[PDB]
Swiss-Prot record:
The keyword tRNA processing does not apply. Belongs to the G-protein coupled receptor T2R family. It is found in: Membrane. This is Taste receptor type 2 member 14. Residues 1-7, 77-87, 239-246 are extracellular. Gustducin-linked G-protein coupled receptor that plays a role in the perception of bitterness. The activity of this receptor stimulates GNAT3, activating the gustducin G-protein pathway. Likely plays a role in sensing the chemical composition of the gastrointestinal content and other extra-oral tissues via the inhibitory G-protein pathways. Changing residue 190 to A/L: Impairs calcium mobilization induced by aristolochic acid and flufenamic acid. Impairs calcium mobilization. Disulfide bonds: none annotated. It catalyses: Ca(2+)(in) = Ca(2+)(out); 3',5'-cyclic AMP(in) = 3',5'-cyclic AMP(out). Core component of the TAS2R14-GNAI1 complex, consisting of TAS2R14, GNAI1, GNB1 and GNG2; within the complex interacts with GNAI1. Core component of the TAS2R14-GNAT3 complex, consisting of TAS2R14, GNAT3, GNB1 and GNG2; within the complex interacts with GNAT3. Core component of the TAS2R14-GNAS2 complex, consisting of TAS2R14, GNAS2, GNB1 and GNG2; within the complex interacts with GNAS2. Gene3D superfamilies: Rhodopsin 7-helix transmembrane proteins (1.20.1070.10). Residues 29-55, 109-129, 191-217 are cytoplasmic.
Length: 284
């Protein structure tokens, strides 16, 4: 039972390593080709290639951790490698997820339309706001590193993964909840605008270019939020309840976001979709 489950999870980890490496490499490579072949780069493209680089680093960290654990368990048992892997993972993961929330704040401040004065003050200073969001949220990183190191010291003075995983998962929930709140507020703004443009102005005489192209991105984004909050709840409940196969499952769950969210980001950027179509054209 345990052996076939571990084999299935190993196959899952190999598949998601392949998908994540291919997707994030595709994002970074497309932006790099567009940069070297004399073309303009938007700010969204810079944030996207920052996410791609960070997610390549994170998926390589977890795959290298799995390679070290499988090939050299004696090396894996040491406290030095464990503490080094834990701290490097938490730094890279904090940077990656807060860059994703920064991209979400960029979308929300650029697109959404509200009458609040504070919202407009943030709305006309988007670059300053995302830079401040990256710099201020380092207090979360310092407190996370502190609490993980306290847990490591307590474990080696009493390896306590049942609290390490819980602390890390709590520290991923805050940017996820901020991104979900910004997404819901953007959807509410678009719905209010649609209700306004459906009763004063007779919609359009064309009715072609509108949110009818963005509903595909909204649908493929809300699907990812649903199927990832489900896996949030499943992983937290299973890690809390009784599991003793925690390492491979947690190594699988840590690679889920940087592998699937890049594929979601491909389906939803016009440049990335055009590059994917050109790749599928010249491959044939
Ligand atoms: C948000 C939730 C569902 C997923 C978050 C992923 C976290 C909990 C996972 C992803 C990679 C994992 C690490 C991968 C490798 C090791 C080495 C081993 O000694 C166990 C602990 C440690 C250090 C793991 C701790 C938990 C970990 C950091
Ligand atoms: C692919 C895509 C399309 C759309 C759109 F349909 F609205 F255009 N929106 C998003 N995202 C967000 C929107 C608001 C707040 C946060 C995010 C966010 N969360 N994570 N990354 N960005 N994404």
């Amino acid at each position: 039972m345990g052996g076939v489950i571990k084999s299935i999870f190993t196959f899952v980890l190999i598949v998601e390593f392949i998908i994540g490496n291919l997707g994030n490499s595709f994002i970074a490579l497309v932006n790099c080709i567009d940069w070297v072949k004399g073309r303009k780069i938007s700010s969204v493209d810079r944030i996207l290639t920052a996410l791609a680089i960070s997610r390549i680093s994170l998926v390589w960290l977890i795959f290298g951790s799995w390679c070290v654990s499988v090939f050299f368990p004696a090396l894996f048992a040491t406290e030095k490698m464990f503490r080094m892997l834990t701290n490097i993972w938490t730094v890279i993961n904090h940077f990656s997820v807060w860059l994703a929330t920064g991209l979400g704040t960029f979308y929300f401040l650029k697109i959404a339309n509200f009458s609040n004065s504070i919202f407009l003050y943030l709305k006309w200073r988007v670059k300053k706001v995302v830079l401040v969001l990256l710099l201020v949220t380092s207090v979360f990183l310092f407190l996370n590193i502190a609490l993980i190191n306290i847990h490591i010291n307590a474990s080696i003075n009493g390896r306590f993964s049942s609290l390490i995983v819980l602390t890390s998962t709590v520290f991923i929930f805050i940017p996820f909840t901020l991104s979900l709140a910004m997404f819901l507020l953007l959807i509410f703004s678009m719905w209010k605008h649609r209700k306004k443009m459906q009763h004063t102005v007779k919609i359009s005489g064309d009715a072609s270019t509108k949110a009818h192209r963005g509903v595909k991105s909204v649908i493929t984004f809300f699907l990812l939020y649903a199927i990832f909050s489900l896996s949030f709840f499943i992983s937290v409940w299973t890690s809390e309840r009784l599991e003793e196969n925690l390492i491979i499952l947690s190594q699988v769950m840590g690679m889920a976001y940087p592998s699937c969210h890049s594929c979601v980001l491909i389906l939803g950027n016009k440049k990335l979709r055009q590059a994917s179509l050109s790749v599928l054209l010249w491959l044939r």
